[PDB]
Amino acid sequence: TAGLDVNEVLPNLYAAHNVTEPGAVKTDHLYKGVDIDGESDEGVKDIREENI
Amino acid sequence: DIRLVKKVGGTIDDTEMIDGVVLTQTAIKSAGGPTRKEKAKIGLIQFQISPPKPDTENNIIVNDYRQMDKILKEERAYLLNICKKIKKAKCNVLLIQKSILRDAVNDLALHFLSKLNIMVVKDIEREEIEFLSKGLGCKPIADIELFTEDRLGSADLVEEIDSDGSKIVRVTGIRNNNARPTVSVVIRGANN
Amino acid sequence: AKQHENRLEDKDLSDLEELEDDEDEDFLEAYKIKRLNEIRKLQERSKFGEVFHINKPEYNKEVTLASQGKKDDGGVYVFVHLSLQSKLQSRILSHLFQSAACKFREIKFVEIPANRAIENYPESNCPTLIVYYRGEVIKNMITLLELGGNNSKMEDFEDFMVKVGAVAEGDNRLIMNRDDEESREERKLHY
Amino acid sequence: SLRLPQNPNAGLFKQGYNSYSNADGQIIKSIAAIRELHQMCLTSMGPCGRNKIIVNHLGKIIITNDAATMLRELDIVHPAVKVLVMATEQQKIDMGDGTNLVM
Amino acid sequence: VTILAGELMKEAKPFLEEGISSHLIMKGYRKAVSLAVEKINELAVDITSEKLERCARTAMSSKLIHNNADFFVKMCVDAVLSLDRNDLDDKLIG
Amino acid sequence: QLFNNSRSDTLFLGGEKISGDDIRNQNVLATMAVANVVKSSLGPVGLDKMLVDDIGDFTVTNDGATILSLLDVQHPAGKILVELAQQQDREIGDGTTSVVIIASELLKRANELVKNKIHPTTIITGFRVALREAIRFINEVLSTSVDTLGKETLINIAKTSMSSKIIGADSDFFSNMVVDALLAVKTQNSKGEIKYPVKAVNVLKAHGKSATESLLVPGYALNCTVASQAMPKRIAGGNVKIACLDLNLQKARMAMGVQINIDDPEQLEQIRKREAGIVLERVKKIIDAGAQVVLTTKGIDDLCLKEFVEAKIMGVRRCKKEDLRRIARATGATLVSSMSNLEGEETFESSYLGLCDEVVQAKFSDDECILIKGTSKHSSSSIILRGANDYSLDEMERSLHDSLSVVKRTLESGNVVPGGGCVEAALNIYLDNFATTVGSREQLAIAEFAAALLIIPKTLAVNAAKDSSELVAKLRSYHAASQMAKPEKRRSYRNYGLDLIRGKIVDEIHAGVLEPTISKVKSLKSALEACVAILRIDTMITVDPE
Amino acid sequence: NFGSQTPTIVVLKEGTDASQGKGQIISNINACVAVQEALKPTLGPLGSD
Amino acid sequence: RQLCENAGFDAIEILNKLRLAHSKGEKWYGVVFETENIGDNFAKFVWEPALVKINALNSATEATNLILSVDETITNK
Numbered sequence A: 001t002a003g004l005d006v007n008e009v010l011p012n013l014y015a016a017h018n019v020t021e022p023g024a025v026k027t028d029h030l031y032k033g034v035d036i037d038g039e040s041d042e043g044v045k046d047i048r049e050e051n052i
Numbered sequence B: 001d002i003r004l005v006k007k008v009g010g011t012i013d014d015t016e017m018i019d020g021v022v023l024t025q026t027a028i029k030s031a032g033g034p035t036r037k038e039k040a041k042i043g044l045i046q047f048q049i050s051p052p053k054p055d056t057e058n059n060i061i062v063n064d065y066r067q068m069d070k071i072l073k074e075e076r077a078y079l080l081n082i083c084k085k086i087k088k089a090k091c092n093v094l095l096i097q098k099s100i101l102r103d104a105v106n107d108l109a110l111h112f113l114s115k116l117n118i119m120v121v122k123d124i125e126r127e128e129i130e131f132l133s134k135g136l137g138c139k140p141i142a143d144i145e146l147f148t149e150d151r152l153g154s155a156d157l158v159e160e161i162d163s164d165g166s167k168i169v170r171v172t173g174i175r176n177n178n179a180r181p182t183v184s185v186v187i188r189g190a191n192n
Numbered sequence C: 001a002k003q004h005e006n007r008l009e010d011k012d013l014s015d016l017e018e019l020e021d022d023e024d025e026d027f028l029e030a031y032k033i034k035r036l037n038e039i040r041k042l043q044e045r046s047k048f049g050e051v052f053h054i055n056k057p058e059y060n061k062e063v064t065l066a067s068q069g070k071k072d073d074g075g076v077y078v079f080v081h082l083s084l085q086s087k088l089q090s091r092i093l094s095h096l097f098q099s100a101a102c103k104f105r106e107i108k109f110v111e112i113p114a115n116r117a118i119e120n121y122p123e124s125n126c127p128t129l130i131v132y133y134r135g136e137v138i139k140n141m142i143t144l145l146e147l148g149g150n151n152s153k154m155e156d157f158e159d160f161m162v163k164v165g166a167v168a169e170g171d172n173r174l175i176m177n178r179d180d181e182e183s184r185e186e187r188k189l190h191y
Numbered sequence D: 001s002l003r004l005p006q007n008p009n010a011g012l013f014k015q016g017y018n019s020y021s022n023a024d025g026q027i028i029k030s031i032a033a034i035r036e037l038h039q040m041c042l043t044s045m046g047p048c049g050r051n052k053i054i055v056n057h058l059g060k061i062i063i064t065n066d067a068a069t070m071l072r073e074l075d076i077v078h079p080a081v082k083v084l085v086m087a088t089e090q091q092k093i094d095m096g097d098g099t100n101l102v103m
Numbered sequence E: 001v002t003i004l005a006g007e008l009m010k011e012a013k014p015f016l017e018e019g020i021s022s023h024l025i026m027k028g029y030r031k032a033v034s035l036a037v038e039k040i041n042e043l044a045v046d047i048t049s050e051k052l053e054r055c056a057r058t059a060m061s062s063k064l065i066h067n068n069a070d071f072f073v074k075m076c077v078d079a080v081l082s083l084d085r086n087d088l089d090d091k092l093i094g
Numbered sequence F: 001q002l003f004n005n006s007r008s009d010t011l012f013l014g015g016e017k018i019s020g021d022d023i024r025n026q027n028v029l030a031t032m033a034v035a036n037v038v039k040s041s042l043g044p045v046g047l048d049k050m051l052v053d054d055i056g057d058f059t060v061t062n063d064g065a066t067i068l069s070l071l072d073v074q075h076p077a078g079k080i081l082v083e084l085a086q087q088q089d090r091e092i093g094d095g096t097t098s099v100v101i102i103a104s105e106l107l108k109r110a111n112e113l114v115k116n117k118i119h120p121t122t123i124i125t126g127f128r129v130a131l132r133e134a135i136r137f138i139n140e141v142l143s144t145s146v147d148t149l150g151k152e153t154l155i156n157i158a159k160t161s162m163s164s165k166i167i168g169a170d171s172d173f174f175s176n177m178v179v180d181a182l183l184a185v186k187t188q189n190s191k192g193e194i195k196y197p198v199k200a201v202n203v204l205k206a207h208g209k210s211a212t213e214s215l216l217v218p219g220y221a222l223n224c225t226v227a228s229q230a231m232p233k234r235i236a237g238g239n240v241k242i243a244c245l246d247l248n249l250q251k252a253r254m255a256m257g258v259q260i261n262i263d264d265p266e267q268l269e270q271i272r273k274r275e276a277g278i279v280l281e282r283v284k285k286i287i288d289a290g291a292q293v294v295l296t297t298k299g300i301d302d303l304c305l306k307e308f309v310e311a312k313i314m315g316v317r318r319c320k321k322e323d324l325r326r327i328a329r330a331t332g333a334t335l336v337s338s339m340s341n342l343e344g345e346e347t348f349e350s351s352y353l354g355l356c357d358e359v360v361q362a363k364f365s366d367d368e369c370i371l372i373k374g375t376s377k378h379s380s381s382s383i384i385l386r387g388a389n390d391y392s393l394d395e396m397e398r399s400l401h402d403s404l405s406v407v408k409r410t411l412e413s414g415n416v417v418p419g420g421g422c423v424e425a426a427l428n429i430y431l432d433n434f435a436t437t438v439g440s441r442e443q444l445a446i447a448e449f450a451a452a453l454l455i456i457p458k459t460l461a462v463n464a465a466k467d468s469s470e471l472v473a474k475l476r477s478y479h480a481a482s483q484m485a486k487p488e489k490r491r492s493y494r495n496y497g498l499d500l501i502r503g504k505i506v507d508e509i510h511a512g513v514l515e516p517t518i519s520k521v522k523s524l525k526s527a528l529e530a531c532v533a534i535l536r537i538d539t540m541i542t543v544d545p546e
Numbered sequence G: 001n002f003g004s005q006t007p008t009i010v011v012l013k014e015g016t017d018a019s020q021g022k023g024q025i026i027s028n029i030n031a032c033v034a035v036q037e038a039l040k041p042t043l044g045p046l047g048s049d
Numbered sequence H: 001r002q003l004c005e006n007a008g009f010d011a012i013e014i015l016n017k018l019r020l021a022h023s024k025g026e027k028w029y030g031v032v033f034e035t036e037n038i039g040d041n042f043a044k045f046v047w048e049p050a051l052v053k054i055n056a057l058n059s060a061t062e063a064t065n066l067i068l069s070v071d072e073t074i075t076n077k
């Protein structure tokens, strides 16, 4: 629905979760999500600052 | 005297005045002997080239098996000596009228003319005889005995081009130089 | 239902012999005797076969009496041609009469000049084709623009004879039904 | 040969009644029947979702991006699709949130 | 309002034929209309001097009484002056 | 559009009367209604369609040539685009899908100019000055045909014609096939002018293995069955003589209107014998000539088959007229309509016979084909297409037939240009600077003419289901710098287009896609002449049938 | 099983309009442009009624 | 655009004059029907409130964005 190619946006987002929880605490890879408008690649700049 | 020939194909920009008399009909291509003619003598045939018969219906009987050999030989002989007189008069281009009532040509007559490299056409309108005769300077012919060289015209190039599907017969130049020449121009266009 | 009728209906006396080895003799020969009798009737009815170039006194007999025939209502169709040698369609129609005369011997083919037919006839209306039957005019046909005009063919003339009831639809002599031997040869091979 | 016996012992039930077993790929058809209106929901989820025109027989129009709402007006024939209508209707009544997801 | 909305939809026709999504076209107008409202506030004036007459002549355009504005505007301005502030009852102008 | 107009108010016409901008809008929707089926078929990303005849029969077709011919439209404004698709197939043989889209958009984009009170005479004048300026720019931007040490051109030309087809993936195999086919069937005419007769090669509808394993025949393949089954099927040895006859060889009656009449019944059997003997005397002299293979246009009766079976001659009936001219032209024989000469005698000379190396009858999925290979005088070629069914091969037949016309033009005219909407995007930058020079009202006509030319590269991206503005904006950026190239090669930012399989802008010369420039010339004029025909109409007068 | 016909179950009712494709939203724009054409010449003092 | 087409004037000469003359015609630059020319509207005493303009753009922007977020049409019965 965002006018992006799903074949490139979907597996780019899997890379954030294929790098699973290393030995360091306070991992911030959980807030990665899709983006409707903006930057390329798509993992959103967190859903954080966005407040959604 | 100013005939407007309509040919579907091409564009309007390709329209130009043809020097000689352009023919609308295409060639027969039943034999397909000659391809391109140069310095050809044009003749206008009004009679029909066929085996010997009057215009009315007839009855031919066969009382002996030897009569068929004379019939099959003499039928082509009537076509042969016509081609000899055509060869004696060195007439290279022939124009035959429509002639719905009597057969204009056949496979036998086309074969003898194929060896002599003589093109032939059909489906000529009766009203266009004034345009072809006055334009090309060729008097018509309606009898084989009165066929001679003085009644025939002349031309430098007589050919039939195939310009992207649109087939047209074109004549270039007339050496008779009669009193009042004629005009012929083909109209080309994308749409009919 | 039609598969049983096509064995006899769609085969002449020459074609019925194909089923001599396959079908029963009594079933086949019973119909061959019927079709043989029909062929004999056409031979007796073959009183014509060339164009009758007539003149007027005679018209009052040839054209009309004939149309009565036996008068058993043995009617006879009589195709008249008011010929005019100056017209191009008239000479075409004269050729069709002699061609059809050699085939359909039961139908009478009549020809006469149009100037000698009717007092001061319009030359523009010629050639004229009239069809008599039992003294009554079945068809007063006008010039051949209906039948193609200058491009009239033998197939168009035979089709007109079927419309006026002069020849049956499934007649083996008509060019529409008289398929070529090479045509039937290809059908048997591809069957 | 010209005509079948047309399903004998069919007078046990009325002519209008029909059975639909799992065989003959009918469960695949029920999944395909869901796929007809499910693709309508694809273009209606999210912030970039597109609303839908629904003209009723009375003429009252409602333009919307919400599943539970759009499925109220559409008269459905397939019973398996009506399970999604009442499932989304339960979602709207109880929580009032997340109806496209149910669909 | 109508000949303007149709032009925006007619202008959105070839973009929909292209691969432009629907939300991209709406984001442009919704972001541009915010500047148009602010720009119209700058085009408009804060006029208080000179104390109605001129505004009525333009509202009567495109119909019958525009040519007779010399007579109807003189008494039409007196219609609203009878009404006081903060009431503005429309049924009194029946 | 809104409602129907009044029917002959104080005009007294038996039919309908309409006028104003309503019919001008109906012509735009009419050209757009017939163009929508052509939109999805453009470019390699386009998909095919199927037309059902309401009798079960269907045919798969991609090109808009025969699709619009089959679609029976009753609106006469749409008939001009129907005939335009048929016209472009005759002369050029490629781009029927593009002229319909270009002609429709020129009318669609010019519809805005109508309600601006710009007259159509001024609009077409602005289009025509843009046309001849575009033709000269096309004549400047064209490239030579050498490009390297080797040829490296004709293999790439086939890929453009072969794209957007079912066998576009197999174009690498078929590219060598089409170039080897047309180089074999060349001829000589007009004292040095080389010609390439299209359709001279035989396209056979075979079924079997696959389109990838389609064997190219080094010679002509005749599609006909053998007469008798007891004949020899394979004829080996060199110098196989080919006889091409057309006269009537089966037993026929006498002259067309004569009647046989005889009084003496003794000679009734003799006349029957000579009618059966006169037809066998012709077959006797062919055996004396020693023709191993004989071909006849007409039928062959069983009276003639016994002599061919005995003497081991290959007699084939039911040949067609157009085929035997190519057999005689390839094998070196001459067409014989009848056996005669200038003399009164009747005979047959050995010079009439052709020559070939091998003749073999092959059968593949109920398709008997006589494979004639090794013509000594002149070479020939045939392509045996193989696929699923006959209706799928009709798309392949049209795909190959269009490929011959495109490869015909690049050899007749060596000038070519790249694909991917390169010249369509280059003319926009050239015409924008020219539109400002002319000054007056023709600026909008030349400008909107340029905007309509961009629809070709836009449709490639819309049908690809990708983002189109990014590719068009990048293609616009490179072409924008081409006019401002600042010559001193380093003249880059030209000869680029779209790459749809990857979605990038790369060099079309290295990618291996080209198209002849003459196709661009005739398509633009024929598209504009069709646009002139629709714009100049004001009012319609539809008369009902009596 | 209860009938030899086995009718295929349609999703929507009979008579329901068509659905997704090419030209759905364009028809709504052309429908608005059609209504917009009637109100087009009525603009300004030199218009019509 | 349409305001001048109904007046019978050519739109190209008008629309070319509006764009290139906004520098000296800062804000009160518009069409004049009486003199068949283009000039300042402040001298002609033609006025109009701003509330028509704000509600027109907001209603027109809301109208076009309503169905632009629609790609379906369902009509029962």
Ligand SMILES: Nc1ncnc2c1ncn2[C@@H]1O[C@H](COP(=O)(O)OP(=O)(O)O)[C@@H](O)[C@H]1O
Pocket: A034, A035, A036, A052, D045, D046, D047, D097, D098, D099, D100, D101
């Ligand atoms: N601006 C945005 N950026 C990223 N994700 C969003 C944004 N807006 C909505 N979403 C996501 O889209 C989803 C849509 O949920 P949805 O089912 O439409 O909610 P509702 O039940 O209100 O319809 C939400 O779960 C949310 O995570």
Ligand SMILES: Nc1ncnc2c1ncn2[C@@H]1O[C@H](COP(=O)(O)OP(=O)(O)O)[C@@H](O)[C@H]1O
Pocket: F041, F042, F043, F044, F062, F063, F094, F095, F096, F097, F098, F159, F160, F161, F162, F163, F164, F402, F418, F419, F420, F421, F497, F498, F499, F500, F513
């Ligand atoms: N491989 C390709 N890459 C980019 N564009 C192509 C390619 N193949 C074809 N095209 C474009 O498609 C257009 C028309 O293609 P064409 O072969 O005429 O289609 P059709 O065979 O359906 O008529 C050409 O103008 C060309 O630019």
Ligand SMILES: [Mg+2]
Pocket: F094, F095, F160, F161, F162, F402
């Ligand atoms: Mg092509």
